[PDB]
């Protein structure tokens, strides 16, 4: 409604004026179409003589009446007596590559063993794989399908899509029938362009939302679904109708999970129940912690690639929260208690609409890129006096 | 909505530390939509211009498993 829009606009203006005191870096950019996915690629190029480096993002498009694109964008990031710091963004964020894509890009993830290969998740149960070096960087226009109706004929598809970082070409996805597909694209034939699943895991009784490989154990993966369950699977097991472990993770749909990159035992899940949960694989009958502060459903949760005790969460609400595990238990004044628990390190208020995805920059600490339904992409870094204190 | 860039100045960075008691970063960090008292900060910074180790994950897990929910 118009009244809520005005409130949101007022709150954005306040945030924007506050930015120098809350952030060290904020870069914003309006995409032509909203992206439902965001992931930093690992490469950074450092052009000689310049006081910035170049970083790149995989994005996509959500449009229904126009030709969708898998997108690669470049971002210029600064190298390390007046207040503020505002400047122009012109030319700091540019689109390098557009690749025609049939459906909307629900999720896009690069293959860790060769980051030129991007897998994408469509609203159908197929997953597309693209090598962006094998396409032109600017496509010709596309011939759009104009169905006078589209009769939908499948339950939801969750966005779950994870490459195994220890087995090259092994790819998990959340299918549209409560199961999980596994493909192996290493040594696919030369002639064969289509590839069938090596395995189907059945177990969940509702829409599977997310899947993720374990980062160390090559045969372990986790999954979460609308059945309120977290499930740990082992590819070595002969029984693909039952997982190794099954947890009642939450009191509503579980939309996401993420393994902690400094500990083989720790992971986090995020739910429609408005909480993030902390789990230890050595004792999954006990939930270690619950991060409550979010006003709405959690859809994404991601651990800091640089700090073992840091994670961030996002979802339906326009805010993205950053949590510091090391502050769990700390004393607070009663006033600060009202603001939330001490483990809530930072609330990012820059977006004015639902946050679809976000990604921690793997190369510059504390840099995040977040994308929202309003078309906005923000690349930002909170003030060092908040994260060093 | 207008696009922008912010690379916070060295002076603002030191002002944030100097005027810790006015800014209250711990509080501000959880209140994006409250106006920060920048005037007060700028004043006290210009006036006072003539002058962190983290717990291991292991330790946080030890704390948690000894303070159950």
Residue numbers in the entry:
A (entry chain A): 10 to 89, 103 to 411
B (entry chain B): 468 to 518, 529 to 546
Please share excerpts from the published article on this structure.
The nucleosome remodelling and deacetylase (NuRD) complex is one of at least five corepressor complexes that recruits and activates class I histone deacetylase (HDACs) enzymes and directs their activity to chromatin. Metastasis-associated protein 1 (MTA1) (and its closely related homologues MTA2 and 3) are up-regulated in various cancer tissues. They serve as scaffold proteins for the assembly of the NuRD complex. RBBP4 and RBBP7 are WD40 domain proteins with a characteristic seven bladed β-propeller structure.
